[PDB]
């Protein structure tokens, strides 16, 4: 449900909430790109800092995580010993705000809402807005139907009385979300039969590509970007798919970050593994396919370089995108899994030759030759695109170089008949990596359909996040994906 996240409270409001409405074990998370976990223990409120500069959520005195929901789930089911004394996350302190619900539109007239539902709704599309006739109340607007008169818009008053909500009779809810949830499971039936089924929120995030700059300006006033992003973050609770294989003891040492793991149902499975190793089928990587496909994976560790090259070989991948230096801020992010220029190396049963490096402003290109040892004729060229100028924290101020990069990469991939997924990695393989993949997916739509096409940035991000945890980490990357797509639209 993710209700333990309060998008707009203060520290003192968080302590007050935990001391007066929580008990020991009660907790909540809140933003300050930094966040805080606030936890009551022994009648006192502690605040634990979470940092995310773009690769993962770094929790002080804890582990690193792909999403806040996975962070909370870990410390609520595994012990994870969040210590400091031990800090236990027992009871979510739920937030009642509706401001990051997909169906909440706050300020919105009835005629604007009828038009929105008319132009872009279907039977069951709905939304909730602030009542204008009755200050303080709210309105639920639903579309139902099959301009032939076969459809209609129905409005329903939501009374707000003593901070509780109701539709004029029956139960009174502590939040608009509790009311919507309730009347989603138990639809409202009009007198003459029509059941007001709340099937899906009206989609407002989808735009036509030509109007990108207009939306980017809309999102840049008072900020709209943060609202839209945090409404996406609110959807991360639906993506807690199992990641059992990555948690196996034999696979623990193959994870760069212990708790950042691939979903079981999209992970890359490696076959033809030597039968000597009990578990030879595992790597930290997920197939990403827009629903050109991709593999999103972490930066190699010394002990997974051989498994990485089994992946590349097995999937017929011909292009690798690296978006990290080998070492950043003095810390290892990816071991050097390719040979020096002109050299030849064996990695297990795989052999790689670095044929030639080419240096451009933002990136180096390494032309690798990959084959299986003892089996001539399996050789194929793999092109390694190594973006080197990405900032250690945050994102670039201008998307130009990233776009020139992705364009080259796309043309290489397209030029190779029956090439496999493009491999993309950074350190953890979710933040820079998801940003680059999402940008590439959006640009691909436009490449094929021109500027006269529909794009939906959060929808695409959600779709990539169902295939690997936390794809796209921060609001800064979110804005950067917009800004990149804008700049691509204006170069055509």
Ligand X SMILES: CC1(N)CCN(c2cnc3c(Sc4ccccc4Cl)n[nH]c3n2)CC1
- Order of strands across the sheet that contains 138-144: 164-166, 152-161, 138-144, 125-130, 200-201
Comparison of 29 and 232: residue with beta carbon closer to ligand X: 232
Comparison of 315 and 475: residue with beta carbon closer to ligand X: 475
Burial environment of residue 427 by CB neighbours within 10 A (0 to 12, 13 to 18, 19 or more): buried
Residue 306 binds ligand X (CB under 6 A) = no
Using CB under 6 A as the binding criterion, the count of chain residues that bind ligand X stands at 15
Residue 404 binds ligand X (CB under 6 A) = no
Q: Cβ 206 to ligand X, closest distance in Å?
A: 7
Question: Is residue 123 within 8 Å of residue 256, measured between CB atoms?
Answer: no
Backbone angles phi, psi at 462, to 5 degrees: -60, -45
Nearest to 402 by CA among 430, 442, 352: 442
* Binding region for ligand X (CB under 6 A) out of 97-105, 176-184, 347-355, 363-371: 97-105
Residue 456 binds ligand X (CB under 6 A) = yes
Residues 98-117 that bind ligand X (CB under 6 A): 102, 104-105
3-class SS at 475? helix
Comparison of 26 and 175: residue with beta carbon closer to ligand X: 175
Q: Is 473 annotated as belonging to a binding site?
A: yes
Residues 251 and 309: their CA atoms lie apart, in Å, by 17
Q: Cβ 72 to ligand X, closest distance in Å?
A: 19
Question: Is residue 155 within 8 Å of residue 168, measured between CB atoms?
Answer: no
Residue 389 binds ligand X (CB under 6 A) = no
Question: Is residue 256 within 8 Å of residue 298, measured between CB atoms?
Answer: yes
Give the x/- contact pattern for ligand X in 52-91, rule: CB under 6 A: ----------------------------------------
Residue 459 binds ligand X (CB under 6 A) = yes
Q: Is 431 annotated as belonging to a binding site?
A: yes
Q: Cβ 129 to ligand X, closest distance in Å?
A: 9
Residues 235 and 154: their CA atoms lie apart, in Å, by 27
3-class SS at 106? coil
Give the x/- contact pattern for ligand X in 10-49, rule: CB under 6 A: ----------------------------------------
Q: Cβ 207 to ligand X, closest distance in Å?
A: 11
Cα 230 off chain centre by: 11
* Binding region for ligand X (CB under 6 A) out of 118-126, 151-159, 226-234, 343-351: 226-234
Residues 418 and 385: their CA atoms lie apart, in Å, by 19
Q: Which two tokens stand for residue 165?
A: 């909500």
* Binding region for ligand X (CB under 6 A) out of 41-49, 255-263, 305-313, 456-464: 456-464
Q: Cβ 251 to ligand X, closest distance in Å?
A: 30
Instruction: Give the helix ranges, DSSP H, for 122-243.
Output: 176-185, 212-220, 224-233
Q: Cβ 215 to ligand X, closest distance in Å?
A: 11
Q: Is 427 annotated as belonging to a binding site?
A: yes
| b/e sequence 82-119, b meaning 16+ C-beta within 10 Å | beeeebbbebbbbbebbebbbbbbeebeeeebbebbee
Residues 169-208 that bind ligand X (CB under 6 A): 203-205
Length of the chain: 492
Question: Is residue 201 within 8 Å of residue 127, measured between CB atoms?
Answer: yes
Active site residue 334: no
Q: Out of 67, 197, 231, 427, which residue is the one contacting ligand X (CB under 6 A)?
A: 231
Question: Is residue 390 within 8 Å of residue 396, measured between CB atoms?
Answer: yes
Residue nearest ligand X, CB atom distance: 231
Comparison of 112 and 171: residue with beta carbon closer to ligand X: 112
Give the containing element (helix H, strand E) for 347. Answer: strand 344-347
Cα 101 off chain centre by: 16
Comparison of 406 and 464: residue with beta carbon closer to ligand X: 464
Strand spans (E) along 2-137: 26-31, 34-41, 44-51, 57-59, 64-65, 82-83, 86-87, 91-92, 125-130
Q: Out of 95, 237, 426, 453, which one is annotated catalytic?
A: 426
Binding residues: 392, 426-432, 473
Sites of contact with ligand X (CB under 6 A): 102, 104-105, 203-205, 227-228, 231-232, 235, 456, 458-459, 462
> Which residues are part of a known binding site for substrate?
392, 426-432, 473
| Positions marked catalytic | 426
């Amino acid at each position: 449900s993710r209700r333990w996240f309060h998008p707009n409270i203060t520290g003192v409001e968080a302590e007050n909430l935990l001391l007066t409405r929580g008990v020991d074990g009660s907790f909540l998370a809140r933003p300050s790109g930094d966040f805080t976990l606030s936890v009551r223990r022994n009648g006192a409120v502690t605040h634990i800092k979470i940092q995310n500069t773009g690769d993962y959520y770094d929790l002080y005195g804890g582990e690193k995580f792909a999403t806040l929901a996975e962070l909370v789930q870990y410390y609520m089911e595994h012990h994870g010993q969040l210590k400091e004394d031990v800090i236990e996350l027992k009871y979510p302190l739920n937030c009642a705000d509706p401001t990051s619900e997909r169906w909440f539109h706050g300020h919105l007239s009835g005629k604007e809402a009828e038009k929105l539902l008319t132009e872009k709704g279907k039977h069951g599309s709905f939304l909730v807005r602030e009542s204008q006739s009755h200050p303080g109340d709210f309105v639920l607007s639903v579309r139902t139907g099959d301009n032939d008169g076969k459809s209609k818009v129905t409005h329903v008053m939501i009374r707000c009385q003593e901070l509780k909500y109701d539709v004029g009779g029956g139960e009174r809810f502590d939040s608009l979300t509790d009311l919507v949830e309730h009347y989603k499971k138990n639809p409202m039936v009009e007198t003459l039969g029509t059941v007001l089924q709340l099937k899906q929120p009206l989609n407002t995030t989808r735009i036509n590509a030509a109007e990108i700059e207009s939306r980017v300006r809309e999102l840049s006033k008072l900020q709209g970007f943060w609202e839209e992003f945090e409404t996406l973050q609110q959807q991360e609770c639906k993506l807690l798919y199992s990641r059992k294989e990555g948690q196996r003891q034999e696979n623990k040492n193959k994870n760069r970050y212990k708790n950042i793991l691939p979903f079981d149902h999209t992970r890359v499975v490696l076959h033809d593994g030597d039968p000597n190793e009990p578990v030879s089928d595992y790597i930290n990587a997920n197939i990403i396919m827009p629903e050109k496909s991709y593999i999103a994976t972490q930066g190699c560790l010394q002990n997974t370089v051989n498994d990485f090259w089994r992946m590349v070989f097995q999937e017929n991948s011909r292009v690798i995108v690296m978006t990290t230096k080998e070492v950043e801020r003095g810390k290892s992010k990816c071991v050097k899994y390719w040979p020096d220029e002109y050299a030849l190396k064996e990695y297990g049963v795989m052999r790689v030759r670095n044929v030639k490096e080419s240096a451009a402003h933002d990136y180096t290109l390494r032309e690798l030759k990959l084959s299986k040892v003892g089996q001539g004729n399996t050789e194929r060229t793999v092109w390694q695109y190594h973006f080197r100028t990405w900032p250690d924290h945050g994102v670039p101020s201008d998307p130009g170089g990233v776009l020139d990069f992705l364009e080259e990469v796309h043309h290489k991939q397209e030029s190779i008949m029956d090439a496999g997924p493009v491999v993309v990695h950074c350190s953890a393989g979710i933040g820079r990596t998801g940003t680059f993949i999402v940008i590439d997916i959006l640009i691909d739509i436009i490449r094929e359909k021109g500027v006269d096409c529909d794009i939906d940035v959060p929808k695409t991000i959600q779709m990539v996040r169902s295939q690997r945890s936390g794809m796209v980490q921060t609001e800064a990357q979110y804005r950067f994906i917009y800004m990149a797509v804008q700049h691509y639209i204006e170069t055509l």
